[PDB]
Write a protein that binds this ligand. Structure first.
Ligand SMILES: CCCC[C@H](Cl)CCCCC(=O)SCCNC(C)=O
Ligand SMILES: CCCC[C@H](Cl)CCCCC(=O)SCCNC(C)=O
Lengths: 368, 367
């Protein structure tokens, strides 16, 4: 399977990280929440993000959850349509010649976003769809793997994957309600301190955006040398870590416990060592890593586990700095950057790695 | 690709339709809602459901728990049902979990991580198990998942995959229907249609789980006499998103009366195109397995294809026994066919389901 091209789409409002930190501090202050405001600055600074796109409005006067979901759906569709149209235009592919449209998003959508897009883009009415959910930050890498598996059996076909997330939905009421309750119960329940920090970290980290990728089977006319080929992929799920990472219905609450970066270690090396060995490759001979930046702590952990030079994962840090954590879309944005870089040397190997709720990890071996 | 075996799983409480009708009437009465109570009984009777399984409680109908606690219970019941069905499937086929390569799931139960990921802590699947967690397909999910697993197994002829579908319709009885029927009846003659649609939702949808084991052609279990998936196809009717789906409000089920008429735009284009490309006609089909997805749907398929009054009886009997269990329904029906019926060698069958989109899915089977 060949990765042919990529595109991204972002909403119109880009906020400096310092403005978002200030917006949350003002919420704490207007609400008279008894909490150290310097903790907001600390985590908004320590995530190493310069600014974020928010599709939904920037705390004090929240709409109904129904209205926020309606806006989230609309914005998800708008971003996905933009990305897919840019993708089709840049490759000169007609929508009717796409066989499969795969999607990942935690935006609630029944019918799925990919079905609603059939009314915006003239796909054939018999388009095959692959709407995935329950994978969180991992979804971009996960979707690449599932589409590659599909194209194994359909070598003449073309498929599009998109990932789109609206993290700003959490700023429409969920973060406000939860931080208020937690901080006000904190004097009688000091165990809640870590819960407040988790919500502040969520507010510091997650952003909005969309990425899309065109992939084709080996017999497709766009399967040309010089493109990255997906040569293998593998999944891993670490036992008994469901509670470390997820998205719970309450609005929503993001779950991201500090123990993630250590539980990551239990899955990363068996997953990647096994994938590489089964393909007769040594990690030291990888030309490129494309690692989803769950956080700076996650990047540091991957770097330490595989003894990497600190420049090897620079793309993860630059991406975090530019757009924040855009969840499943992040590795597609990252792949897009790489496809804009200098033509990778022939026969160079690359690894895409992402981690998400599960705790689950996905690894994809690429060859140029 | 072969369908090797099926299983089902249901919660402990089976309620007669009259008991459910009575509970809803009691709600209208305690709340002093000004609405003809005979509309409740008429719709609960006219869907021709004898009873339904509810995993979530009915006794709290007047004082429902919080939506957060309902979701947590819905997750736990979803996991329990899927674990039970999967375990029965593995036991009846003598297949070890470690020997399953792909676990595919469909469910509207909110789950991040997905149900299939969570199930890896209850069933000793390999840690490198491949997963296919689908959503956004509603009632079409069981047929949809069969097609997607079939496409996967085309590329993996040595492998075995499990699909499960599970839905907890009783979630809507934990506050959503109560709130919406109250407000709607209070308020605007144009709102009569909205109340009817919530009453029909309350009359129709039920809980359950189905599971299927499928293998590629080179798997040891791939044996003659098992149904083969020979082809499958999807169809989405343009500009009908608003006719069916599930909206966040709790949840509100959307099922517009126009659905059955809108199905006519997709059914024959889908099925006759699929059959023609496999060199057969619909009249060649020995068995139909059609999801019973809302008023007039069965009747509409029957009319479109000129079928005899008994060709779709399995749809009606299924609705009678367990109601509309959404994505799981066609797996329960396939289970009945494989376990209780005789299928002549080399005969053709068609699985058909319809769901939010408006989308339809067809799968051609050959024994
Ligand atoms: C508008 C529709 C509502 C969208 C809801 Cl709020 C999706 C959550 C968005 C925030 C994230 O993407 S958090 C990514 C890391 N979290 C996990 C579980 O991996
Ligand atoms: C379990 C927690 C919330 C899950 C929700 Cl309440 C399940 C959906 C409502 C009951 C059904 O199965 S309706 C099937 C027809 N409707 C569609 C969209 O196809």
């Amino acid at each position: 399977t060949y990765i042919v091209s990529t595109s991204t789409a972002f909403p119109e409002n880009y906020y400096p990280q310092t403005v978002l930190a200030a917006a949350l501090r003002r919420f704490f202050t207007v609400m008279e929440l008894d909490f150290d405001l310097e903790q907001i600055d600390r985590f908004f600074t320590n995530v190493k993000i310069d600014g974020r796109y928010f599709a939904l409005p920037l705390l004090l006067d929240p709409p109904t959850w129904g209205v926020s979901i309606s806006r989230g759906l609309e914005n998800s569709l708008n971003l996905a349509e933009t990305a897919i149209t840019k993708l089709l235009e840049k490759t000169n592919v007609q929508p009717q010649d796409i066989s499969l449209l795969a999607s990942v998003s935690m935006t609630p959508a029944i019918p799925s976003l990919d079905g609603r897009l059939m009314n915006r883009i003239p796909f054939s009415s018999t388009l095959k769809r692959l709407p995935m959910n329950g994978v969180g930050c991992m979804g971009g890498a996960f979707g690449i793997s599932r589409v590659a598996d599909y194209l194994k059996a359909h070598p003449k076909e073309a498929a599009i994957l998109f990932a789109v997330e609206i993290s700003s939905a959490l700023w429409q009421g969920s973060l406000q309600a939860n931080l208020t309750s937690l901080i006000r119960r904190l004097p009688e329940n000091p165990s809640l301190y870590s819960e407040i920090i988790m919500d502040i970290i969520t507010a510091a980290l997650f952003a909005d955006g969309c990425g899309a990728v065109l992939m084709v089977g080996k017999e497709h006319p766009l399967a040309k040398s010089g493109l990255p080929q997906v040569i293998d992929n593998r999944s891993f799920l670490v036992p008994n870590t469901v509670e470390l990472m997820g998205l719970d219905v309450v609005g929503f609450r993001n779950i991201l416990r500090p123990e993630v970066s250590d539980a990551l270690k239990q899955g990363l090396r068996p997953l990647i060592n096994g994938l590489l060995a089964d393909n007769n490759i040594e990690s030291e001979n990888l030309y490129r890593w494309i690692v989803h930046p769950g956080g700076p702590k996650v990047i540091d952990t991957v770097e330490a586990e595989f003894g990497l030079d600190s420049q090897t994962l620079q793309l993860s840090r630059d991406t975090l700095a530019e757009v924040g954590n855009i969840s499943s879309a992040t590795v597609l944005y990252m792949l897009d950057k790489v496809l804009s870089e200098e033509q990778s040397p022939p026969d160079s190997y690359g690894l895409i790695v992402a981690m998400g709720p599960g705790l689950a990890q996905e690894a994809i071996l690429l060859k140029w």
